[PDB]
mmCIF file of all heavy atoms in Angstrom:
data_model
loop_
_atom_site.group_PDB
_atom_site.id
_atom_site.type_symbol
_atom_site.label_atom_id
_atom_site.label_comp_id
_atom_site.label_asym_id
_atom_site.label_seq_id
_atom_site.Cartn_x
_atom_site.Cartn_y
_atom_site.Cartn_z
ATOM 1 N N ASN Z 1 -8.587 -2.849 52.798
ATOM 2 C CA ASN Z 1 -7.795 -1.913 52.021
ATOM 3 C C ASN Z 1 -8.592 -1.425 50.819
ATOM 4 O O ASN Z 1 -8.805 -2.209 49.881
ATOM 5 C CB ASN Z 1 -6.507 -2.586 51.558
ATOM 6 C CG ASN Z 1 -5.519 -1.621 50.942
ATOM 7 O OD1 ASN Z 1 -5.760 -0.412 50.904
ATOM 8 N ND2 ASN Z 1 -4.389 -2.145 50.483
ATOM 9 N N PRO Z 2 -9.038 -0.161 50.787
ATOM 10 C CA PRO Z 2 -9.820 0.329 49.642
ATOM 11 C C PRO Z 2 -9.006 0.541 48.374
ATOM 12 O O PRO Z 2 -9.450 0.175 47.278
ATOM 13 C CB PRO Z 2 -10.434 1.636 50.162
ATOM 14 C CG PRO Z 2 -10.202 1.628 51.676
ATOM 15 C CD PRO Z 2 -8.945 0.846 51.862
ATOM 16 N N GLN Z 3 -7.823 1.173 48.492
ATOM 17 C CA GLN Z 3 -7.007 1.469 47.315
ATOM 18 C C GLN Z 3 -6.668 0.210 46.541
ATOM 19 O O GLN Z 3 -6.653 0.213 45.307
ATOM 20 C CB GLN Z 3 -5.744 2.219 47.724
ATOM 21 C CG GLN Z 3 -4.910 2.721 46.550
ATOM 22 C CD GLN Z 3 -5.618 3.804 45.754
ATOM 23 O OE1 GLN Z 3 -6.474 4.512 46.278
ATOM 24 N NE2 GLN Z 3 -5.284 3.921 44.476
ATOM 25 N N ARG Z 4 -6.392 -0.883 47.262
ATOM 26 C CA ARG Z 4 -6.115 -2.158 46.602
ATOM 27 C C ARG Z 4 -7.314 -2.624 45.788
ATOM 28 O O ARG Z 4 -7.172 -3.114 44.665
ATOM 29 C CB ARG Z 4 -5.709 -3.210 47.619
ATOM 30 N N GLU Z 5 -8.527 -2.478 46.335
ATOM 31 C CA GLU Z 5 -9.724 -2.892 45.608
ATOM 32 C C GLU Z 5 -9.954 -2.051 44.365
ATOM 33 O O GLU Z 5 -10.296 -2.583 43.288
ATOM 34 C CB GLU Z 5 -10.936 -2.821 46.538
ATOM 35 C CG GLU Z 5 -10.886 -3.782 47.716
ATOM 36 C CD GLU Z 5 -11.233 -5.211 47.321
ATOM 37 O OE1 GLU Z 5 -11.970 -5.384 46.321
ATOM 38 O OE2 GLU Z 5 -10.761 -6.141 47.990
ATOM 39 N N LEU Z 6 -9.784 -0.732 44.462
ATOM 40 C CA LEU Z 6 -9.939 0.119 43.300
ATOM 41 C C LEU Z 6 -8.899 -0.215 42.217
ATOM 42 O O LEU Z 6 -9.225 -0.289 41.024
ATOM 43 C CB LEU Z 6 -9.849 1.596 43.673
ATOM 44 C CG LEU Z 6 -10.914 2.083 44.666
ATOM 45 C CD1 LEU Z 6 -10.668 3.527 45.045
ATOM 46 C CD2 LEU Z 6 -12.314 1.906 44.108
ATOM 47 N N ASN Z 7 -7.653 -0.432 42.632
ATOM 48 C CA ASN Z 7 -6.622 -0.827 41.685
ATOM 49 C C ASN Z 7 -6.931 -2.177 41.057
ATOM 50 O O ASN Z 7 -6.676 -2.386 39.870
ATOM 51 C CB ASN Z 7 -5.255 -0.846 42.371
ATOM 52 C CG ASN Z 7 -4.785 0.534 42.763
ATOM 53 O OD1 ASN Z 7 -5.488 1.533 42.568
ATOM 54 N ND2 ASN Z 7 -3.580 0.613 43.334
ATOM 55 N N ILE Z 8 -7.498 -3.106 41.844
ATOM 56 C CA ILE Z 8 -7.891 -4.401 41.282
ATOM 57 C C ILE Z 8 -8.938 -4.208 40.196
ATOM 58 O O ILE Z 8 -8.841 -4.809 39.107
ATOM 59 C CB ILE Z 8 -8.401 -5.344 42.396
ATOM 60 C CG1 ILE Z 8 -7.244 -5.814 43.279
ATOM 61 C CG2 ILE Z 8 -9.139 -6.531 41.800
ATOM 62 C CD1 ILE Z 8 -7.667 -6.745 44.386
ATOM 63 N N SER Z 9 -9.947 -3.390 40.463
ATOM 64 C CA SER Z 9 -10.952 -3.105 39.438
ATOM 65 C C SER Z 9 -10.307 -2.576 38.157
ATOM 66 O O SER Z 9 -10.541 -3.078 37.058
ATOM 67 C CB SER Z 9 -11.983 -2.112 39.967
ATOM 68 O OG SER Z 9 -13.052 -1.932 39.043
ATOM 69 N N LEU Z 10 -9.458 -1.547 38.323
ATOM 70 C CA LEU Z 10 -8.834 -0.917 37.153
ATOM 71 C C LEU Z 10 -7.974 -1.913 36.374
ATOM 72 O O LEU Z 10 -8.060 -1.999 35.137
ATOM 73 C CB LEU Z 10 -7.992 0.275 37.607
ATOM 74 C CG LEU Z 10 -8.754 1.498 38.135
ATOM 75 C CD1 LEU Z 10 -7.789 2.532 38.700
ATOM 76 C CD2 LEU Z 10 -9.624 2.108 37.044
ATOM 77 N N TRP Z 11 -7.145 -2.686 37.092
ATOM 78 C CA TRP Z 11 -6.229 -3.612 36.442
ATOM 79 C C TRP Z 11 -6.984 -4.726 35.743
ATOM 80 O O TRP Z 11 -6.621 -5.138 34.639
ATOM 81 C CB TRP Z 11 -5.240 -4.189 37.452
ATOM 82 C CG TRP Z 11 -4.441 -3.194 38.281
ATOM 83 C CD1 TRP Z 11 -3.897 -3.425 39.509
ATOM 84 C CD2 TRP Z 11 -4.120 -1.817 37.959
ATOM 85 N NE1 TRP Z 11 -3.254 -2.309 39.971
ATOM 86 C CE2 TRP Z 11 -3.366 -1.316 39.044
ATOM 87 C CE3 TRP Z 11 -4.369 -0.988 36.871
ATOM 88 C CZ2 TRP Z 11 -2.893 -0.011 39.065
ATOM 89 C CZ3 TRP Z 11 -3.896 0.309 36.898
ATOM 90 C CH2 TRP Z 11 -3.158 0.797 37.983
ATOM 91 N N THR Z 12 -8.034 -5.257 36.386
ATOM 92 C CA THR Z 12 -8.824 -6.308 35.755
ATOM 93 C C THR Z 12 -9.463 -5.794 34.457
ATOM 94 O O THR Z 12 -9.384 -6.466 33.420
ATOM 95 C CB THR Z 12 -9.912 -6.806 36.713
ATOM 96 O OG1 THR Z 12 -10.604 -5.685 37.285
ATOM 97 C CG2 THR Z 12 -9.301 -7.656 37.819
ATOM 98 N N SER Z 13 -10.071 -4.613 34.516
ATOM 99 C CA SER Z 13 -10.667 -4.067 33.304
ATOM 100 C C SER Z 13 -9.617 -3.894 32.213
ATOM 101 O O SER Z 13 -9.823 -4.308 31.063
ATOM 102 C CB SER Z 13 -11.333 -2.722 33.620
ATOM 103 O OG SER Z 13 -12.310 -2.877 34.638
ATOM 104 N N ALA Z 14 -8.455 -3.343 32.564
ATOM 105 C CA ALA Z 14 -7.411 -3.097 31.572
ATOM 106 C C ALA Z 14 -6.909 -4.401 30.947
ATOM 107 O O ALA Z 14 -6.790 -4.495 29.727
ATOM 108 C CB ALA Z 14 -6.247 -2.338 32.219
ATOM 109 N N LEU Z 15 -6.621 -5.414 31.763
ATOM 110 C CA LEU Z 15 -6.059 -6.652 31.242
ATOM 111 C C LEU Z 15 -7.081 -7.434 30.422
ATOM 112 O O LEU Z 15 -6.735 -7.983 29.362
ATOM 113 C CB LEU Z 15 -5.532 -7.509 32.402
ATOM 114 C CG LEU Z 15 -4.407 -6.896 33.229
ATOM 115 C CD1 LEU Z 15 -3.928 -7.865 34.302
ATOM 116 C CD2 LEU Z 15 -3.244 -6.466 32.334
ATOM 117 N N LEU Z 16 -8.325 -7.525 30.895
ATOM 118 C CA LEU Z 16 -9.360 -8.175 30.101
ATOM 119 C C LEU Z 16 -9.539 -7.473 28.767
ATOM 120 O O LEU Z 16 -9.677 -8.125 27.733
ATOM 121 C CB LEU Z 16 -10.669 -8.233 30.872
ATOM 122 C CG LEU Z 16 -10.699 -9.021 32.184
ATOM 123 C CD1 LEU Z 16 -12.040 -8.821 32.888
ATOM 124 C CD2 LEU Z 16 -10.434 -10.487 31.927
ATOM 125 N N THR Z 17 -9.532 -6.133 28.773
ATOM 126 C CA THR Z 17 -9.605 -5.400 27.527
ATOM 127 C C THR Z 17 -8.432 -5.753 26.615
ATOM 128 O O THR Z 17 -8.614 -6.033 25.436
ATOM 129 C CB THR Z 17 -9.637 -3.886 27.793
ATOM 130 O OG1 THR Z 17 -10.791 -3.565 28.571
ATOM 131 C CG2 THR Z 17 -9.687 -3.135 26.479
ATOM 132 N N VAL Z 18 -7.226 -5.794 27.187
ATOM 133 C CA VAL Z 18 -6.033 -6.110 26.391
ATOM 134 C C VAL Z 18 -6.209 -7.441 25.671
ATOM 135 O O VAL Z 18 -6.073 -7.530 24.445
ATOM 136 C CB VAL Z 18 -4.778 -6.117 27.295
ATOM 137 C CG1 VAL Z 18 -3.633 -6.846 26.610
ATOM 138 C CG2 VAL Z 18 -4.377 -4.710 27.655
ATOM 139 N N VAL Z 19 -6.553 -8.489 26.423
ATOM 140 C CA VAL Z 19 -6.602 -9.833 25.834
ATOM 141 C C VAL Z 19 -7.760 -9.965 24.851
ATOM 142 O O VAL Z 19 -7.581 -10.416 23.700
ATOM 143 C CB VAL Z 19 -6.679 -10.887 26.944
ATOM 144 C CG1 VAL Z 19 -6.660 -12.288 26.353
ATOM 145 C CG2 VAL Z 19 -5.534 -10.723 27.923
ATOM 146 N N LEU Z 20 -8.962 -9.575 25.279
ATOM 147 C CA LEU Z 20 -10.131 -9.745 24.418
ATOM 148 C C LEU Z 20 -10.043 -8.879 23.177
ATOM 149 O O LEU Z 20 -10.480 -9.300 22.103
ATOM 150 C CB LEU Z 20 -11.395 -9.429 25.202
ATOM 151 C CG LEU Z 20 -12.034 -10.536 26.035
ATOM 152 C CD1 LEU Z 20 -11.123 -11.007 27.170
ATOM 153 C CD2 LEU Z 20 -13.376 -10.083 26.606
ATOM 154 N N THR Z 21 -9.428 -7.693 23.279
ATOM 155 C CA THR Z 21 -9.228 -6.869 22.095
ATOM 156 C C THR Z 21 -8.098 -7.368 21.227
ATOM 157 O O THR Z 21 -8.117 -7.123 20.021
ATOM 158 C CB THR Z 21 -8.978 -5.422 22.510
ATOM 159 O OG1 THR Z 21 -7.923 -5.370 23.490
ATOM 160 C CG2 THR Z 21 -10.243 -4.798 23.081
ATOM 161 N N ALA Z 22 -7.095 -8.058 21.781
ATOM 162 C CA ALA Z 22 -6.143 -8.751 20.926
ATOM 163 C C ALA Z 22 -6.858 -9.752 20.034
ATOM 164 O O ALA Z 22 -6.667 -9.776 18.808
ATOM 165 C CB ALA Z 22 -5.100 -9.467 21.782
ATOM 166 N N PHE Z 23 -7.738 -10.563 20.635
ATOM 167 C CA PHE Z 23 -8.498 -11.527 19.839
ATOM 168 C C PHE Z 23 -9.397 -10.818 18.818
ATOM 169 O O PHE Z 23 -9.427 -11.193 17.645
ATOM 170 C CB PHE Z 23 -9.314 -12.426 20.756
ATOM 171 C CG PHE Z 23 -8.504 -13.243 21.706
ATOM 172 C CD1 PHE Z 23 -8.927 -13.488 22.998
ATOM 173 C CD2 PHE Z 23 -7.282 -13.770 21.298
ATOM 174 C CE1 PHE Z 23 -8.151 -14.248 23.857
ATOM 175 C CE2 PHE Z 23 -6.512 -14.524 22.148
ATOM 176 C CZ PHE Z 23 -6.948 -14.767 23.448
ATOM 177 N N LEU Z 24 -10.151 -9.816 19.275
ATOM 178 C CA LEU Z 24 -11.028 -9.053 18.398
ATOM 179 C C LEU Z 24 -10.272 -8.443 17.223
ATOM 180 O O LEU Z 24 -10.694 -8.546 16.074
ATOM 181 C CB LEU Z 24 -11.722 -7.949 19.191
ATOM 182 C CG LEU Z 24 -12.594 -6.961 18.423
ATOM 183 C CD1 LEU Z 24 -13.801 -7.661 17.803
ATOM 184 C CD2 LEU Z 24 -13.028 -5.810 19.316
ATOM 185 N N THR Z 25 -9.121 -7.819 17.505
ATOM 186 C CA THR Z 25 -8.349 -7.152 16.462
ATOM 187 C C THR Z 25 -7.807 -8.160 15.459
ATOM 188 O O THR Z 25 -7.867 -7.916 14.242
ATOM 189 C CB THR Z 25 -7.199 -6.370 17.096
ATOM 190 O OG1 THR Z 25 -7.735 -5.340 17.944
ATOM 191 C CG2 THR Z 25 -6.348 -5.731 16.031
ATOM 192 N N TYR Z 26 -7.260 -9.267 15.941
ATOM 193 C CA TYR Z 26 -6.707 -10.253 15.010
ATOM 194 C C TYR Z 26 -7.791 -10.894 14.141
ATOM 195 O O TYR Z 26 -7.625 -11.019 12.924
ATOM 196 C CB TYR Z 26 -5.934 -11.321 15.757
ATOM 197 C CG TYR Z 26 -5.328 -12.361 14.865
ATOM 198 C CD1 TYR Z 26 -4.203 -12.076 14.091
ATOM 199 C CD2 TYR Z 26 -5.875 -13.637 14.767
ATOM 200 C CE1 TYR Z 26 -3.662 -13.015 13.252
ATOM 201 C CE2 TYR Z 26 -5.324 -14.594 13.939
ATOM 202 C CZ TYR Z 26 -4.227 -14.278 13.177
ATOM 203 O OH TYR Z 26 -3.664 -15.218 12.339
ATOM 204 N N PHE Z 27 -8.907 -11.300 14.748
ATOM 205 C CA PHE Z 27 -9.950 -11.957 13.979
ATOM 206 C C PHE Z 27 -10.711 -10.997 13.052
ATOM 207 O O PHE Z 27 -11.104 -11.386 11.946
ATOM 208 C CB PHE Z 27 -10.929 -12.698 14.899
ATOM 209 C CG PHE Z 27 -10.293 -13.869 15.597
ATOM 210 C CD1 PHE Z 27 -10.730 -14.271 16.839
ATOM 211 C CD2 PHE Z 27 -9.243 -14.554 15.010
ATOM 212 C CE1 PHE Z 27 -10.152 -15.357 17.485
ATOM 213 C CE2 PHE Z 27 -8.655 -15.629 15.641
ATOM 214 C CZ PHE Z 27 -9.112 -16.029 16.881
ATOM 215 N N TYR Z 28 -10.945 -9.759 13.486
ATOM 216 C CA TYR Z 28 -11.768 -8.861 12.690
ATOM 217 C C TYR Z 28 -11.009 -8.241 11.527
ATOM 218 O O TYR Z 28 -11.552 -8.091 10.427
ATOM 219 C CB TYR Z 28 -12.334 -7.772 13.605
ATOM 220 C CG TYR Z 28 -13.517 -7.000 13.039
ATOM 221 C CD1 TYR Z 28 -14.795 -7.529 13.066
ATOM 222 C CD2 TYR Z 28 -13.347 -5.723 12.519
ATOM 223 C CE1 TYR Z 28 -15.875 -6.829 12.563
ATOM 224 C CE2 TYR Z 28 -14.423 -5.010 12.017
ATOM 225 C CZ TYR Z 28 -15.684 -5.569 12.036
ATOM 226 O OH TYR Z 28 -16.764 -4.862 11.540
ATOM 227 N N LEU Z 29 -9.748 -7.866 11.754
ATOM 228 C CA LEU Z 29 -8.910 -7.187 10.772
ATOM 229 C C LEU Z 29 -8.099 -8.126 9.875
ATOM 230 O O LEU Z 29 -7.481 -7.639 8.905
ATOM 231 C CB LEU Z 29 -7.981 -6.206 11.486
ATOM 232 C CG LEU Z 29 -8.710 -5.211 12.385
ATOM 233 C CD1 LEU Z 29 -7.758 -4.194 12.950
ATOM 234 C CD2 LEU Z 29 -9.848 -4.538 11.637
ATOM 235 N N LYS Z 30 -8.056 -9.426 10.156
ATOM 236 C CA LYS Z 30 -7.191 -10.344 9.408
ATOM 237 C C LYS Z 30 -7.469 -10.340 7.916
ATOM 238 O O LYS Z 30 -6.541 -10.432 7.112
ATOM 239 C CB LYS Z 30 -7.353 -11.767 9.965
ATOM 240 C CG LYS Z 30 -8.799 -12.230 10.054
ATOM 241 C CD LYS Z 30 -8.905 -13.738 10.239
ATOM 242 C CE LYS Z 30 -8.529 -14.469 8.973
ATOM 243 N NZ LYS Z 30 -8.782 -15.941 9.091
ATOM 244 N N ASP Z 31 -8.739 -10.242 7.522
ATOM 245 C CA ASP Z 31 -9.153 -10.438 6.132
ATOM 246 C C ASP Z 31 -9.284 -9.128 5.361
ATOM 247 O O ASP Z 31 -10.108 -9.052 4.435
ATOM 248 C CB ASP Z 31 -10.467 -11.218 6.085
ATOM 249 N N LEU Z 32 -8.508 -8.113 5.712
ATOM 250 C CA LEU Z 32 -8.629 -6.793 5.094
ATOM 251 C C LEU Z 32 -7.492 -6.526 4.113
ATOM 252 O O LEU Z 32 -6.356 -6.929 4.339
ATOM 253 C CB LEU Z 32 -8.630 -5.702 6.168
ATOM 254 C CG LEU Z 32 -9.872 -5.671 7.066
ATOM 255 C CD1 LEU Z 32 -9.832 -4.448 7.965
ATOM 256 C CD2 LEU Z 32 -11.143 -5.705 6.232
ATOM 257 N N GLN Z 33 -7.823 -5.825 3.030
ATOM 258 C CA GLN Z 33 -6.879 -5.493 1.973
ATOM 259 C C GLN Z 33 -6.576 -4.010 2.014
ATOM 260 O O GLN Z 33 -7.501 -3.186 2.054
ATOM 261 C CB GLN Z 33 -7.433 -5.885 0.602
ATOM 262 C CG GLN Z 33 -7.854 -7.345 0.488
ATOM 263 C CD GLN Z 33 -8.720 -7.603 -0.726
ATOM 264 O OE1 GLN Z 33 -9.016 -6.704 -1.493
ATOM 265 N NE2 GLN Z 33 -9.139 -8.862 -0.890
ATOM 266 N N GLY Z 34 -5.291 -3.671 1.991
ATOM 267 C CA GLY Z 34 -4.858 -2.294 1.971
ATOM 268 C C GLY Z 34 -4.485 -1.693 3.320
ATOM 269 O O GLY Z 34 -4.558 -0.460 3.467
ATOM 270 N N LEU Z 35 -4.091 -2.506 4.302
ATOM 271 C CA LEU Z 35 -3.677 -1.972 5.587
ATOM 272 C C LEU Z 35 -2.328 -1.268 5.476
ATOM 273 O O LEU Z 35 -2.107 -0.238 6.117
ATOM 274 C CB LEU Z 35 -3.627 -3.091 6.642
ATOM 275 C CG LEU Z 35 -4.864 -3.987 6.714
ATOM 276 C CD1 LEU Z 35 -4.678 -5.062 7.765
ATOM 277 C CD2 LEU Z 35 -6.102 -3.151 7.008
ATOM 278 N N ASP Z 36 -1.411 -1.841 4.684
ATOM 279 C CA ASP Z 36 -0.064 -1.289 4.568
ATOM 280 C C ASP Z 36 -0.095 0.142 4.035
ATOM 281 O O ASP Z 36 0.731 0.974 4.426
ATOM 282 C CB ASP Z 36 0.778 -2.177 3.660
ATOM 283 C CG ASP Z 36 0.172 -2.344 2.284
ATOM 284 O OD1 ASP Z 36 -1.072 -2.324 2.162
ATOM 285 O OD2 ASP Z 36 0.948 -2.490 1.315
ATOM 286 N N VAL Z 37 -1.031 0.448 3.133
ATOM 287 C CA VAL Z 37 -1.096 1.788 2.561
ATOM 288 C C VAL Z 37 -1.530 2.810 3.611
ATOM 289 O O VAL Z 37 -1.201 3.993 3.517
ATOM 290 C CB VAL Z 37 -2.046 1.800 1.342
ATOM 291 C CG1 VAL Z 37 -1.912 3.105 0.580
ATOM 292 C CG2 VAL Z 37 -1.758 0.614 0.444
ATOM 293 N N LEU Z 38 -2.276 2.379 4.631
ATOM 294 C CA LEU Z 38 -2.774 3.282 5.663
ATOM 295 C C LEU Z 38 -1.883 3.307 6.912
ATOM 296 O O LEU Z 38 -2.192 4.032 7.853
ATOM 297 C CB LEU Z 38 -4.207 2.912 6.047
ATOM 298 C CG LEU Z 38 -4.562 1.643 6.807
ATOM 299 C CD1 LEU Z 38 -4.897 2.011 8.226
ATOM 300 C CD2 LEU Z 38 -5.730 0.964 6.134
ATOM 301 N N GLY Z 39 -0.776 2.562 6.923
ATOM 302 C CA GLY Z 39 0.182 2.587 8.014
ATOM 303 C C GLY Z 39 0.269 1.359 8.898
ATOM 304 O O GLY Z 39 1.100 1.375 9.808
ATOM 305 N N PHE Z 40 -0.498 0.302 8.670
ATOM 306 C CA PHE Z 40 -0.342 -0.891 9.506
ATOM 307 C C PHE Z 40 0.997 -1.554 9.191
ATOM 308 O O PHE Z 40 1.196 -2.077 8.100
ATOM 309 C CB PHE Z 40 -1.487 -1.873 9.296
ATOM 310 C CG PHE Z 40 -2.788 -1.480 9.941
ATOM 311 C CD1 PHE Z 40 -3.026 -0.194 10.352
ATOM 312 C CD2 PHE Z 40 -3.774 -2.438 10.142
ATOM 313 C CE1 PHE Z 40 -4.218 0.153 10.947
ATOM 314 C CE2 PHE Z 40 -4.972 -2.089 10.727
ATOM 315 C CZ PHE Z 40 -5.194 -0.801 11.132
ATOM 316 N N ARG Z 41 1.907 -1.537 10.166
ATOM 317 C CA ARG Z 41 3.235 -2.114 9.985
ATOM 318 C C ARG Z 41 3.224 -3.625 10.191
ATOM 319 O O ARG Z 41 3.790 -4.367 9.390
ATOM 320 C CB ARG Z 41 4.248 -1.448 10.925
ATOM 321 C CG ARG Z 41 5.681 -1.858 10.621
ATOM 322 C CD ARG Z 41 6.681 -1.011 11.390
ATOM 323 N NE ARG Z 41 6.446 0.418 11.219
ATOM 324 C CZ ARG Z 41 6.998 1.147 10.251
ATOM 325 N NH1 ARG Z 41 7.822 0.613 9.371
ATOM 326 N NH2 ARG Z 41 6.713 2.444 10.176
ATOM 327 N N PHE Z 42 2.587 -4.082 11.262
ATOM 328 C CA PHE Z 42 2.535 -5.497 11.626
ATOM 329 C C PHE Z 42 1.193 -6.133 11.276
ATOM 330 O O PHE Z 42 0.728 -7.037 11.994
ATOM 331 C CB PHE Z 42 2.868 -5.685 13.096
ATOM 332 C CG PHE Z 42 4.241 -5.162 13.480
ATOM 333 C CD1 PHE Z 42 4.429 -3.832 13.783
ATOM 334 C CD2 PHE Z 42 5.319 -6.020 13.539
ATOM 335 C CE1 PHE Z 42 5.676 -3.352 14.130
ATOM 336 C CE2 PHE Z 42 6.576 -5.558 13.876
ATOM 337 C CZ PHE Z 42 6.753 -4.228 14.171
ATOM 338 N N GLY Z 43 0.570 -5.658 10.210
ATOM 339 C CA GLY Z 43 -0.697 -6.191 9.733
ATOM 340 C C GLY Z 43 -1.871 -5.888 10.637
ATOM 341 O O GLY Z 43 -1.992 -4.808 11.219
ATOM 342 N N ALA Z 44 -2.768 -6.880 10.756
ATOM 343 C CA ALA Z 44 -4.036 -6.671 11.448
ATOM 344 C C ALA Z 44 -3.860 -6.339 12.924
ATOM 345 O O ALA Z 44 -4.627 -5.551 13.482
ATOM 346 C CB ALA Z 44 -4.913 -7.906 11.271
ATOM 347 N N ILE Z 45 -2.875 -6.961 13.577
ATOM 348 C CA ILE Z 45 -2.686 -6.792 15.014
ATOM 349 C C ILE Z 45 -2.164 -5.405 15.404
ATOM 350 O O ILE Z 45 -2.254 -5.032 16.578
ATOM 351 C CB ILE Z 45 -1.753 -7.908 15.534
ATOM 352 C CG1 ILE Z 45 -1.936 -8.074 17.043
ATOM 353 C CG2 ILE Z 45 -0.312 -7.626 15.176
ATOM 354 C CD1 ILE Z 45 -3.369 -8.358 17.457
ATOM 355 N N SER Z 46 -1.647 -4.622 14.448
ATOM 356 C CA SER Z 46 -0.981 -3.362 14.778
ATOM 357 C C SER Z 46 -1.853 -2.364 15.556
ATOM 358 O O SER Z 46 -1.350 -1.799 16.555
ATOM 359 C CB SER Z 46 -0.467 -2.718 13.492
ATOM 360 O OG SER Z 46 0.020 -3.697 12.588
ATOM 361 N N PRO Z 47 -3.096 -2.099 15.179
ATOM 362 C CA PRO Z 47 -3.893 -1.170 16.001
ATOM 363 C C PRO Z 47 -4.114 -1.651 17.425
ATOM 364 O O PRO Z 47 -4.146 -0.818 18.333
ATOM 365 C CB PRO Z 47 -5.212 -1.055 15.230
ATOM 366 C CG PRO Z 47 -5.278 -2.287 14.420
ATOM 367 C CD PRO Z 47 -3.879 -2.559 14.006
#
């Protein structure tokens, strides 16, 4: 089944991006001052 394989590629890329960027966003943005003034509602994790 080719369509299943292409969807697997897409979904794997998307989910790995989701999780690893959750970690990246929380660790990189945690120590920043002035997020609320620029629109971050839920702090570092918001973007």
Side-chain angles (χ1 to χ4, degrees), residues 1-3 5-30 32-47:
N1 190 3
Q3 187 66 26
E5 295 283 333
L6 299 177
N7 293 2
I8 288 180
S9 186
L10 291 173
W11 305 155
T12 49
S13 303
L15 298 183
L16 298 173
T17 299
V18 163
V19 182
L20 274 64
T21 51
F23 299 143
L24 175 65
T25 297
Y26 180 74
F27 293 151
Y28 197 79
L29 306 186
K30 52 165 288 187
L32 291 187
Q33 305 165 0
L35 311 179
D36 58 328
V37 191
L38 70 106
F40 285 17
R41 189 170 308 270
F42 301 84
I45 200 56
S46 323

